[model samples]
Target: LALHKVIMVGSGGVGKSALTLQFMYDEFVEDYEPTKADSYRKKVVLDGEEVQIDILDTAGQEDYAAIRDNYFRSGEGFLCVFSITEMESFAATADFREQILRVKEDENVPFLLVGNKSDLEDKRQVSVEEAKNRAEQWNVNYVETSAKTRANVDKVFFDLMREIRARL
Candidate 1:
């Protein structure tokens, strides 16, 4: 089996931990306690092959930016998460994207622009088209997910794994 490292990043409370936990444990979380950096390793079958995925759930606080940069360097893939309920969170994705591009120095890096909390669509401040357009301009895959309902949550990780495997 091959091994891979993926990082989850975004503004705090954007459901980074929720999405990770949902995919890794098949559990739902309403309120996620902040984690500076938590690591989860899961063995998954991808394209009929077994592979171990090491995930790093990163903090969104600017206080941890330095450490996050180092963590970014270690990752093979990334899920740049944002909350649809908040427009600022969506706007902040560009900074995260730029940092990842700079740290990895690869325009074609395995990455995804994720809009989490689809379950709260009634409270959404960022429109789907706007988010998709931002991703399109960056030339990265974009997906909307809900950790609460587990909608498209698995797909993000699976798609990211496929991207990483293709690079491998």
Candidate 2:
């Protein structure tokens, strides 16, 4: 089976783990914890083909920055996540994008700008248009997902895998 490596980068409390777990097991986690790093593997049917997806969930805290470059180098695609409820998290996506580009040194790397926690629309701080504008500027697709409601969670991963496969 073909294997695709994906990485999740974003600010803490933005639900990177929540999204990953939801996609992996169809369960939503309500508790929040900061991740230093975590890895998961799942066999998924991508466009009728069986493939394994390896996900590396990286730390959002700056202290883990030293080791993130190593993980970033191995990633075939990236899901850059941010919480729509937090403007600071949305602002941090730019830095994550720059860091990934610097390590991968590829402008066309399969990437997605993800606005997570869409279920909390009432608390939204980042507007969809603003997120889309950044995505357009970076020449990448932008998607909003809610790990809690499981909305568009699968699309982001599958869409990214297709992009990675296209490059191959």
Candidate 3:
């Protein structure tokens, strides 16, 4: 089966794993618990063609520079997830994008910015307009998603696949 590998980055409790779960399994956890040891690898059929998606889901709390760089080296594309509920998560996108640039990412690596947990709008602090502006400045695709509602979660991956195929 033909495949593509990708890495996702986000701070702790940003619903990164949940997003993947909803996309791959079409299920949402009412009470989600995430761990550092958990990473997702799934084989999905896109347009009747099978592709392997090996995701390296690292703990965002750990600030090791090298480990992140290791993941960067292996990834063909990156999906940067942030929580609208947390300012730090949104701020970290700049740092992470700079890191990717430092690694000699030529011609703009296919990337996307995801604002997770739109289901928790009551807790949201970041405005959708602001996020769109920031993502624009970062020069990447951006979307807000709710893992609970399965809203825009799967679209992120499917759109990415189309972009990757086009890039190839």
Candidate 4:
């Protein structure tokens, strides 16, 4: 682990893994699917210095109790993600944030709520204002990102690392 860390959490098929891969690798997987566990580490630069990020691309399973707790303790920041195409994912963000806050030494660990897959604007089921409003209500920054089109994807990643640096 490095000085700062980030863990992603959301409901199944919400693109949590997709968002993580997109940020870490700068490439979106079209059909890259995983049935079991997978993880990686990526070096991100903030202010011209490299920062090691231990990326935990977790499975969306019900029995992630121990994994979830250990993540909260190990991470310095978080990416609470969701899908603009799924409403249930939005509902789960609250509980996820609560879990992080429970273990965080600082109540305010720099975070960004990412509403992913904005490329599906035509088929989008969740409204932007609703998602932004919810993220604000949760006391975190918000961004509607599209990993497919890469719209605001880099922006969110850079902004998040900058926020984490400021905290340091």
Best by the lDDT measure:
2
Ranking by lDDT: 2, 1, 3, 4
Q: Which candidate is the best by TM-score?
A: 2
What residue pairs are clashing in model 4?
A: none
The digit string of per-residue lDDT tens for model 2 on 1-168 reads 999999998988898999998999899987646755678999999999999999987765545666768778889999999999999999999998999999989888999999999999999999999999999999999999999999999999999999999985
Better structure of 2 and 4 per TM-score: 2
Give the TM-score of each candidate.
0.94, 0.95, 0.87, 0.86
Q: Could you tell me which residue pairs clash in candidate 2? A: none
Q: What overall lDDT goes with each candidate model?
A: 0.90, 0.92, 0.76, 0.75
Q: State the lDDT of candidate 1 residue by residue for 54-161, as single tens digits.
A: 998886554666776787888999999999999999999989889999899999999999999999989999999999899899899899999999999989998999
Model 3, TM vs. native: 0.87
Model 3, runs deviating above 4 Å: 30-34, 61-64
Candidate 4 lDDT over 40-118, as tens digits, reads 7777676678777665666665376777687668776777788888888888888878888887756578788989888
lDDT, candidate 1, residue 66?
74
Deviating ranges (above 4 Å) for candidate 4: 62-64
Residue 46's lDDT in candidate 4? 63
